[model samples]
Target: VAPVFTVTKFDKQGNVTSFERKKTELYQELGLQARDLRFQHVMSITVRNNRIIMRMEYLKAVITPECLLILDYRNLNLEQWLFRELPSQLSPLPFEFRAIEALLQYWINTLQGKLSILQPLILETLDALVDPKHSSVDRSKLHILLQNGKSLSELETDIKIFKESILEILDEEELLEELCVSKWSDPIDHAEEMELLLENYYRLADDLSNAARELRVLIDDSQSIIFINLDSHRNVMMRLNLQLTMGTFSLSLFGLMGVAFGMNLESSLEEDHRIFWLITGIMFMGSGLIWRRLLSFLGRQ
Candidate 1:
């Protein structure tokens, strides 16, 4: 991306402060191991005496930038920081940034929230796919969900579009077992903290499974709606095609007689203006009546 990214900070009391960093000096500050961690694929977590480190992957493109988040338990309010970098574009894609922020906001709001602090993290990740303001869904329905969902062949395409980037929560769960818990030498209760993290980690895994099942049903309904709509459209088009064909065949009423006259056949009022219009009027009205009847028949159906 460009040479820009945003940094935001939040506290246990839910207060937040934000800033910007134009360079990667912080990685150097954290030492060279973090320097190799790219933003496009930072899916690891670390625990330290003063802070817990989590790399929030924001970009999934070939160009990677890591959104490094650190929560310090024993530090001053401003000493706590959430750091990430994203450059601006003419029509910048905002989903990755907004989604990560939404997750951050969830954790921040849970400072004194009813659920565990970790619950909101998982919820925000799952909720990312449906965030109206930050949605990456197609603005037009027919091009994606409706058309693809209805067609059995498009199941893979629909599933591809239905994916979410909430797997970082799972990464943290894995990182938990390997965490050096005894290193957090602060005055807080390390045992309780570990228990809370592990408790929510298992709960999050179960809820994720249930949510996946829910989405399966959601996709089924979406497919049904698309099928019904396509069926109705096909019917309407068929009616129009039938009416057109009837009107085309009805043209024979005038075409055959006019051709017969051109063949020098014996007929009355061959040069009479009255007969010419009378014949013409009859053929015109006859073809119109055929089209009208075809439309009415379709309407009744």
Candidate 2:
């Protein structure tokens, strides 16, 4: 079969039983849409028609009072461990509760793991950018840092959105009662117990969201510092350009004196060859003095 299903069921005593079936077979067996079986990175949970449907980055499954049915795709590493852990983590509660906890725990821990990896990388990049001793940092590292910041933002949004969904269920007693499918039956009393379960994981996600937000702020602050440095560097270049232009102005003055003398107007200095040499010597000496004066005025502040 191109796409398949692995359905797991538990007894009242927390015993485990597993089986596999084709996608079409599962569609026929369970009253769910084919769209739910499509592959994508998703995070959601819905309870309808006495069934709990969940979609996560690494999971797609339908839970009922009778059994938990999973849409098997790549046999991911987390998926492999989930089967083992689900059974071991079984509690003295409804079958669906343990299953839900297993999936939530996996997704939360996965985000935690990703944050762990990104945290150190972003810190290192920030250090390199801020340290003056490094002088110039490689552009590639900045690019990587930007990409990591984006990933962190997306992770935070997913966590918040996931937490919001949990809050939605908690707010609606009907949905909460539906989630307790084995009990199907709501007394608002059971919702309290389930609410506690949902809140346990919801708190974890909220904390993670806060952490990611703090990290994002750090990145933005570092970027501001970077912009300041760039602007200051540009200012230095502008000052140097102004000095060069001032030096050109002095040279132009020397050129204008030469052009005036070469005009061949009525001038006794040009009539005497000795006067010509004397004027030429004076011109050179004067230009030299002016050049030195300009240098002292503009060269060092």
Candidate 3:
């Protein structure tokens, strides 16, 4: 009941008036699979038959990115998550939606040759996503952060985003080319500018892919440092405490001996003037030995 979709239809004008909204419906309509969108993958643009299916996510349990349609719809619950997770420059509208109707509206406008309508609703949003802009979370701004390693991977999502944008544009370009030849309904209008964008897209995809790979390594290294520090911190504190604590007892080894030398009990040994020097020298030697042993113990830690 919950997992289904409605497909979009572009017009004599060529646009999505309305479409279905379910993953299952999309699979049924396009002959794909539920697991394609739901599992083991996060960012993808799957093209089959005449329809192409695209997915973009803002974040991942690990890393993800966000949107577009060569031709689609599901608004279900995702837009709420998307817009809520969205940065507010996305729309001045007071409401935040993860899955929004604006995404719905833009595809319809594109069909009407006002693909530019998406300038605010989708394109600006896409540009915002792909260029890698994110606010330092409000609460985190004040402190010197030890672990913002997540920043290293934001471009991983942008990479997915750049790929998604290109896929939608090129997939539509392919569809438009085929549609123009068939004498089907009115041909798509993007025919003229399509090649220019496609050419640029091909070049950018190369850079985008490499940058994504670079970011992956950077993230891995950052996490390694962070977790290594986390692990070493405990060992440092434990061994430091042991060093100080164990060495503290070594002071007792000399303390009572000094007290014994101070005791007032009279003896001929005390009367011998040279005895003072001998006792002083021996205590000094004993203390030096104990100190070296304990100090060496601290250093070993």
Candidate 4:
């Protein structure tokens, strides 16, 4: 049962301003009593001007009973203040800073995580172009770069080969004229090479942006689940309290009935037992009818 903290930054209109943080709490708060675990438990920090406000929710790993903590830091001026304040706040805690550092480090690492995943695809596209066995274009431009020991020469060479391949495929005079008019370049065109680089950059950026958007949506969904769970627990507690109160009232009423019967302990109608039984049956029927009407009235309310 690992505890998670969800940190959010908000604008004046209540929209999220930037990336939110969600991580296990036990790893963040290693030492200190439950009362002193302020920094570790902090889920969000909002900053405006020189003022900083933190919102925190404290919860146990198993029970999920939460308490909120708000801390206001005064007079701080820094470009990025989170990195500096976080370490000092957790210094009093028992665990090594390395472990705490790892959890905090995740915030930066997740974005890089996406970039790492995207890099290979881009590299593969370059490989398809530059690989001699696959590429029809001559590799002289690429060969020079490789001989000169330039990093990413292979990718540059691939771009050159791709342009030649495109030009060869559209070798007809009419097609060539169209290619020129459309600003398409030949193998040696520097503008075409720049176009390829920009294309790859824009494509990767688009993918990363889409991935980030989806991740934000999922985080919002998770936060909604937490809110729903809390509301459900509260409803159950309220019902339990009502049941306990009603049960106590019913027990008291039964005790009063017992007292009344005990005081009048007499078989007054022993000679007319049949008539007494008839009267008792009538009383039960009347009570049932009265109870049914009371329930119906309460139901409408």
Q: Whose lDDT is greatest here?
A: 2
**For model 1, what is the alpha-carbon lDDT of residue 244?**
75
Query: What lDDT score belongs to each candidate, Candidate 1 first?
Result: 0.43, 0.76, 0.43, 0.38
TM-score of 1: 0.38
- Per-residue lDDT of model 3, residues 1-301, tens digit only: 6854343332221222345466655566454566544534455534343223444442211111122232222534444433342233233211111122233223222222321231233323223333312321222321212222233245445545555655665656555453222233223343554455445555655564564465446445544554565566667778778766655655565567767876888655766768777777777777667767877866776
The 10 consecutive residues of candidate 1 with the worst lDDT sum are 85-94
Residue-wise C-alpha lDDT for candidate 4, range 1-301, written one tens digit per residue:
4444433222222232223223434324332233433455324322222122223222111101011121232233321443443334333211222222323233234444644554454344334434434213335633642432332333333334333433442334443233222132221543443344334433443455555445435435544654565566677777667655655554555556545544655756456767756765655565556556655654576
- Indicate the worst ten consecutive residues by lDDT in candidate 4: 59-68
Clashes of each: 6, 0, 24, 1
Poorly placed runs, candidate 2 (over 4 Å): 1-19, 23-41, 132-137, 185-189, 248-301
- Sort by lDDT, top down from the best: 2, 3, 1, 4
57 Cα displacement, candidate 1 (Å): 2.4
**Which structure is stronger by lDDT: 3 or 4?**
3
Give the clashing pairs for model 4: 31-94
Q: Lowest summed lDDT over 10 consecutive residues: which window, candidate 3?
A: 59-68
Per-residue C-alpha lDDT of model 2 across residues 195-219, encoded as one tens digit per residue: 8989999999889988898988998
TM-score of each: 0.38, 0.75, 0.38, 0.29
Q: Which regions of candidate 1 are displaced past 4 Å?
A: 1-41, 47-53, 58-193, 205-220, 251-255, 258-301
